[PDB]
Subunit: 331 residues, 2 copies
């Protein structure tokens, strides 16, 4: 009977945002990055994924938010699933049922929560009994950012140099996370975005300013960790802000050059400058798109939102706390 | 009789575009730059200025393209005229009649040609008998880029260290200019631009990435000068292209960050990349606004234009050869 045979599991993983950036791969196939990255795991945003391995199935199936997935997005997950199958030592195809509590039409990325959730769900389903390290490795090979979403709070993706040594590790921050939040200003762009995978490889392999990135990253890593250790908010925010801008500076050197940023991105940056000037510490970062994310202390969260509303619509403004705990299995 | 008494002169100065950039003043009031710059003087674009000093005149008057100028622009030129009066040793007010053959509503800057033509017209009018050096100085203190337009072909603004030592000098290029042209792609952005004077001061004083500019500028000058002496187009083209992109990289680090570039700027850059791939060497540069300028060999000018027209409107595309001779007095 099916209920004797099927192997199944369900997990919930939250998104994380990179404060110290992953930008450029050393190894493209294996998703080994050129540098370590530091992230913060967000409470509001997650993916919940169920996976059901069944011997009778001939293809993987994938549903996202109740809609059957077809095309290259299904092709992509089936490739990932061959890796999970290879690792578990099992040949059964699977039905994947996933729900995103991530506003990705708002251009919020779900890659991070999607493969952490799927890895966690497979680990459950197939009784792989993976450590967090091994679980982070499995998420990493589908999406680099997802390695980090095994953990709550502050996480560091250790680059390593092979499939075995590249994974995320929890950063000790002594509940520093509990005082902080992030504000997202969602921004609509006319032009279709440069896709992140293509975009970072073009820059990493091609940019006349990529050395600038590599020259400063280890400093930024040590500085970020040290401010985290010391619960120094201004010191952390300053590194992360210049870090993200340098990430973006590098795209300007690529052959040919490109930008993730639009004028409205810059308008949010001006408002966060005015906010600091006004006595409210907060710091911006941008990923592979025009949206601006703002690290703030919870004590000033509303003060920052009020200033943003003088310039931006209420529907453009989302916030989240930092969730202190890691990946959850749904029982 | 008025004709016994009045002192008048008329000149034509052409615009110049910087290939190795002026970006950052060491001294604001005196317009001393943080670094040398190398420009090419353009044949198609220019200003013609007549000045008439008259002893009955109680105020300076300024007509541009036959329209009377009032407000801040008149104020600005009367300040400049005060300097010219002081240097000449005369106290007579003047009537300035200027015609721009530069399309400035297209965002092409006339600062370069306007203060050179004015300085040259005053030097005639008042019989200052200024060397090319001292004339370049006089232009410099109204607009920095204008120092360079005393010369045709290739010119270098030597930063010096005072009002006396900061001026432009002609570069020996052995008729390299004659083989070259520039294409302008005019771009209409829908935000108002950051004014250049304010923009370069904010960045010079504030940018997290401005050290990067200064760390690379001397090599870039030496390299550009070397490729000019050697008539090496691709070698010149490569430095001038990276040089301009680094200029823009700097504004990204300012407090708060800004950009001169818009999406359409980037599209022009993608097209010059494709032109190079297709066998047509050309190289792009950008100033304090979104227009893209393309340095090309004349043999390939039409070819780049044809490729630009697959993407851009005919009215967006202006070209110019490099004029080899310097500032002209009229009569």
């Amino acid at each position: 009977h099916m209920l004797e045979m099927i192997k199944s599991g369900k997990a919930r993983a939250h998104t994380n945002i990179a404060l110290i950036k992953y930008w450029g791969k050393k190894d493209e196939a294996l998703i080994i990055p050129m540098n370590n990255s530091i992230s913060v795991t967000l409470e509001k945003f997650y993916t919940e994924t169920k996976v059901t391995f069944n011997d009778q199935l001939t293809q993987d199936q994938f549903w996202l938010n109740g809609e059957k997935v077809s095309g290259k997005e299904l092709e992509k997950i089936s490739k990932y699933m061959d890796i999970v199958r290879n690792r578990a030592g099992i040949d059964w195809y699977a039905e994947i049922e996933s729900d995103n509590f991530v506003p990705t039409a708002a251009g919020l990325a779900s890659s991070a929560s999607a493969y952490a959730a799927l890895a966690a769900a497979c680990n459950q389903a197939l009784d792989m009994q993976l450590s967090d390290k091994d679980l982070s490795r499995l998420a990493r090979i589908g999406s680099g950012s997802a390695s980090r979403s095994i953990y709550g709070g502050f996480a560091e993706w250790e680059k390593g140099y092979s499939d075995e040594t590249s994974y995320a590790v929890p950063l000790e921050s002594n509940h520093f996370e509990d005082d902080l939040a992030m504000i997202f200003v969602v921004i609509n762009q006319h032009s279709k975005k440069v896709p992140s995978r293509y975009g970072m490889s073009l820059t990493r392999n091609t940019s006349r300013f990529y050395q600038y990135w590599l020259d400063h990253i280890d400093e930024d890593l040590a500085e970020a960790k040290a401010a985290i250790q010391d619960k120094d908010f201004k010191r952390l925010g300053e590194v992360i802000e210049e870090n993200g801008l340098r990430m973006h500076a590098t795209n300007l050197g690529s052959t040919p050059p490109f930008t993730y940023l639009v004028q409205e991105s810059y308008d949010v940056m001006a408002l966060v400058h005015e906010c600091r000037e006004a006595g409210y510490p907060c710091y911006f970062t941008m990923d592979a798109g025009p949206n601006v994310k703002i690290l703030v202390e919870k004590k000033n969260k509303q003060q920052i939102i009020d200033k943003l509303l003088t310039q931006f619509d209420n529907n453009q403004i989302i916030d989240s706390d930092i969730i202190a705990t890691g990946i959850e299995i749904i029982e």
